[PDB]
Design a protein around this ligand. Structure first.
Ligand SMILES: O=C(O)Cc1cc(I)c(Oc2ccc(O)c(I)c2)c(I)c1
Ligand SMILES: O=C(O)Cc1cc(I)c(Oc2ccc(O)c(I)c2)c(I)c1
Lengths: 293, 293
């Protein structure tokens, strides 16, 4: 059974990595590009970009441990632990060449440590719509003059007592729709069918828990990154962020400047947090052009 | 019927104020002191302080509109709107003399406007454990290096689509235990028996909704207070705050200095948000002594 429809010419498959069965969708020919999704989603958020990229690259889009059809991590959910799985998965398919990495949302948290620790393995890097976990996140406000902030979920999801699983269970579809649309500019792209598919996936009890364990490990990830960041990133990097409601605006590039020697950034007007779906055509174009250099 | 046990020698009664039936518990003789509870609780948080105060004062402890056994407000939930009900209630019992006010948590939000607008009616004032709604609240962090922040619930409760009622309905008892204990230093005072009492009250559907409407009106209260605060409070004031986990610490007094000419503050070590229950002996002593001047 597949949680999401696989594009033509792609295959849904699994690899064991350090005793954890990871799911991915793979297609194309050429140098490897790995696309890593974030919270509330799965490999499927990349399904529009994948066929275009597959004209020039071998494309792999894994499900993060515990999410989609991937088994939970056996080590832990901190960025350094999760990044091992993703790095080793990429290396199974690109053992002899560096590969490209594109990540969205918590896909950034789960890849940054393997990028900085294995720079020779990373040809080009694209990061969109999430802070790298560091002390900057402690400044985001709990509440705004316009009401509900965009970041209060960091605390909701990190809270103990399984607070988030307990309140969201039985209301997974309701909560996800609220979360996705409140972080969107272009809500129309989230059809009832698309929301149904994402909700069914993250509502699997181990996946609902996995979702929040990423946040329960966030402080540990920040502490980890405090040490890792002593080494600057040297590979060509591009950042993307939405400039509309729900988006991160200038933060993405400005943070990345502290991490990378060679970075260019774009802010996409009229687009929120969910760039691959809200603004597929220009996002796809920018990613394809940057990687095709 | 009574949701909470009335102390010996007190009465539970109701008063209709501008078309809204307010519940209160009253006892004692002498000048009037009104005690106003906050979120998650009812008049009952004051039940240990009340008999002591009643030796020197007429004591009234109302349920906030919509909470406990009080009807929802008919105007709205902004501070200025709710303060009218509380001011009129007090003045029914003390029409020719000023009265004392003690308020905790959102009790502050719901009384500040009537204090500033009717300064001659307030002899002495005690505020504990909440910010007065102003722009300072936009600076509190969504997430901290220790985990769950103090005020992330501001956004949860303010969120559209009845997000909070939808998630919390049926899980009120679970949620309230988490909320109260996460904001406490001395968690041991929150027995299952006591939590049962509070949860059964706020689980009434109109009470669960009323609770969150106070937060949905928070930005309105901030706008209201920006005008009101152009006049400083002139009456003797005391602030209390917990110095332990969950407490507001030095913020309480520091903010109050901007609002009051005559203020003394105390931070109680090893106590969190729930001062009357976590640290009954020193809190009661501070309040009784201050009002007895
Ligand atoms: O602190 C700054 O410089 C500016 C800043 C402020 C915030 I609130 C913020 O959080 C967001 C915003 C959008 C979003 O979709 C998500 I998920 C989190 C970020 I990233 C940066
Ligand atoms: O950042 C600052 O200025 C200091 C600050 C930080 C926070 I997070 C905060 O919110 C609280 C604190 C305790 C509490 O019990 C509740 I409910 C809310 C406050 I008030 C002040």
């Amino acid at each position: 059974a597949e949680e999401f429809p696989v594009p033509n010419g792609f295959e849904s498959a699994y690899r064991e990595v350090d005793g954890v069965k990871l799911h991915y969708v793979k297609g194309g020919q050429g140098p490897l590009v790995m696309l890593v999704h974030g919270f509330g989603q799965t490999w499927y958020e990349w399904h529009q970009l994948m066929p275009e990229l597959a004209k020039r690259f071998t494309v792999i889009a894994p499900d993060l441990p515990g999410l989609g059809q991937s088994e939970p991590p056996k080590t832990g959910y901190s960025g350094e632990q999760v990044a091992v799985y993703l790095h080793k998965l990429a290396r199974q398919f690109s053992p002899d060449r560096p590969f490209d990495l594109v990540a969205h949302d918590i896909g950034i948290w789960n890849t940054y440590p393997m990028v900085v620790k294995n720079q020779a393995d990373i040809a080009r890097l694209v990061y969109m719509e999430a802070p790298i976990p560091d002390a900057r996140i402690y400044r985001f406000p709990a509440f705004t003059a316009q009401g509900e902030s965009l970041v209060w979920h960091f605390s909701f999801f990190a809270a103990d007592d399984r607070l988030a699983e307990t309140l969201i269970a039985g209301k997974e579809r309701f909560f996800l729709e609220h979360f996705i649309k409140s972080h969107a500019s272009n809500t129309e792209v989230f059809s009832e069918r698309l929301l149904d598919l994402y909700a069914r996936s993250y509502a699997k009890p181990h996946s609902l828990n996995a979702s929040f364990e990423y946040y329960r490990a966030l402080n540990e990830s920040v502490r980890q990154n405090a040490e890792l960041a002593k080494t600057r990133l040297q590979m060509p990097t591009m950042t993307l962020a939405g400039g509309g409601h729900g988006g991160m605006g200038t933060f993405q590039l400005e943070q990345m400047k502290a991490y990378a020697e060679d970075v260019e950034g774009h802010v996409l007007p009229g687009c929120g947090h969910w760039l691959p779906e809200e603004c597929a055509a220009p996002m796809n174009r920018l990613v394809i052009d940057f990687l095709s250099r």
